[PDB]
């Protein structure tokens, strides 16, 4: 593979697709919780189950969108997707009704991202093989400063204009996307061919099993924050400070993982789930706001060293012919955990009063999640294990 | 590389016996990369692995001499030594001095001169 030339504006164009998605999905939330408060209901649970449903069929719907990719190809699906969501986004705009929302957004919408979300993590391999690692990392720190960027924007340059000509506004992105979408070229049902092998079953699942817990800090930490020692001004700070360390520590990480030979990249993964669970069981003691400051570094640290790795280890584990099939049964399987974690963080609140028993039991699943990682088997080990049993 | 050295011994049942040698025609480096092990040939059976050292030094053992015999690796010295405690007549069999690599969707193998170990009353 070339590993450059052509590759920098595949990799140019998969930032702006993970840039624009997720940017468009935390920016929808911000905007529907401001009217909340300004309208009343006119539907308390709904309106937030609505953007979980959005934000979780992304990873829900990507089995089927995997097999979409190997029988068509990148550029068709990633354009398919992008002109499902181009229209998704563009219908939400007519009279505000729930039963219309939920359909408009949650499943035009939540779809469209999904179908445009696989095919610009796999299409990168087709370029990279030695320097894979520095590209998935550039994407990921251009992904995380596009999404930031979002609300920044708008919450400035609206106007104060309504709700109704956000959507608008929002689906030039996805036109954008769609036309950006053409710059895929290639160069290389239900089987279940791909869970023979230990090695991804195990990983796969611990994965799966750290989900849980992973992301209920990056979720109730602003909100925590509202709650205690609340006499902090400055409390966008700590958003900030996040941002900036994960987009830096998705970098470096992209640049380190090439240095790591075979299937010892997943220490990286293992002492990152060790480090964020420590660190999300102690959130609850820091008493200090430049200690918490200081939380938040390693947050944006652990959060890169987990995102920015997975699909190198999948092209490592899979090869290239089955890594589709392997990122699309991960997302699969990751999709539900994530979605169900912070609601039961919401409930504890409900019942303790506090989020630090939140918190207590947001750090066990990553650690169970290491411990999982911690035995994969090594690829002489398979084989000795074959011998053994035959 | 090659595996030169073998071994043996005779035992009553429930004595013991210990095996340990260093190979040659491969460098130490190259040889660290590969694991050792050994195999085993009693008459009128197939030839299996029941023992063997990998890269990380995780042990294994096949069910028949798990529980009983315990296998050790001295990196650089080429050396792997198999430690047989509390023999039994089933352990009357040939076993060969046995090493592995790993290679791009393949292996290498490499087999050593037969070790004769026999338990009789």
């Known amino acids: 593979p070339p590993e450059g030339g052509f590759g920098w504006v595949v990799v140019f164009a998969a930032t702006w697709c993970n840039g624009s998605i997720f940017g468009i999905h935390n920016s929808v939330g911000i905007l529907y919780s401001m009217l909340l408060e300004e309208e009343k209901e006119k539907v308390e649970f709904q309106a937030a189950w609505v953007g979980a449903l959005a934000m979780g069929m992304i990873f829900f719907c990507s089995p089927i969108v995997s097999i979409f990719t190997d029988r068509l190809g990148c550029r068709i699906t990633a354009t398919a997707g992008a002109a499902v969501a181009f229209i998704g986004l563009h219908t939400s705009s007519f009279t505000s009704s729930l039963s219309l929302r939920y359909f408009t957004y949650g499943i035009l919408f939540g779809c469209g991202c999904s179908f445009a979300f696989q095919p610009s993590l796999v299409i990168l391999g087709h370029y990279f093989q030695r320097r894979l690692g520095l590209a998935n990392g550039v994407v990921s720190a251009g992904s995380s400063i596009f999404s930031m960027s979002f609300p920044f924007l708008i919450r400035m340059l609206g106007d104060k204009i309504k709700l109704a000509q956000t959507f608008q506004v929002l689906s030039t992105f996805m036109f954008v996307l769609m036309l950006l979408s053409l710059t895929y070229r290639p160069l290389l049902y239900f089987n279940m061919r791909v869970f023979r092998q230990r090695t991804y079953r195990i990983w796969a699942f611990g994965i799966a099993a750290a989900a849980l817990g992973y992301f209920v800090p990056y979720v109730h930490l602003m909100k925590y924050v509202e709650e205690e020692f609340s006499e902090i001004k400055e409390t966008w700070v700590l958003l900030v400070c996040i941002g900036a360390t994960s987009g830096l520590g998705r970098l470096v990480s992209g640049h380190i993982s090439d240095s790591i030979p075979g299937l010892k990249k997943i220490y990286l993964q293992v002492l990152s789930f060790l480090l964020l669970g420590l660190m999300s069981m102690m959130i609850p003691l820091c008493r200090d706001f430049g200690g918490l400051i200081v939380v938040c570094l390693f947050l944006g640290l652990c959060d890169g060293f987990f995102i920015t790795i997975m699909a190198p280890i999948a092209f490592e584990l899979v090869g290239p012919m089955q890594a589709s099939q392997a990122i699309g049964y991960l997302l699969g399987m990751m999709a539900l955990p994530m979605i169900a974690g912070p609601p039961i963080a919401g409930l504890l609140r409900n019942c303790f009063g506090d989020y630090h028993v939140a918190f207590y039991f947001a750090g066990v699943p990553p650690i169970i999640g290491a411990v999982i990682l911690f035995f994969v088997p090594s690829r002489l080990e398979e084989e000795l294990r074959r011998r053994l049993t035959e | 590389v090659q595996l030169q050295e073998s071994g043996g011994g005779l035992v009553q049942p429930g004595g013991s016996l210990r095996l340990s040698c260093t190979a040659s025609g491969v460098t130490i480096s190259a040889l660290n990369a590969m694991a050792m092990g050994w195999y085993r040939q009693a008459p009128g059976e197939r030839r299996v692995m029941v023992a063997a050292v990998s890269e990380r030094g995780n042990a294994m053992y096949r069910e028949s001499v798990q529980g009983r015999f315990t296998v050790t690796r001295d990196f650089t010295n080429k050396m792997v030594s198999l430690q047989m405690d509390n023999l039994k007549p089933e352990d009357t069999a040939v076993y060969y001095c046995?090493?592995?690599?790993?290679?791009?969707?393949?292996?290498?193998?490499?087999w050593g001169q037969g070790t004769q170990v026999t338990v009789s009353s």
């Open positions: 046995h090493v592995l690599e790993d290679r791009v969707d393949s292996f290498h193998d490499y």
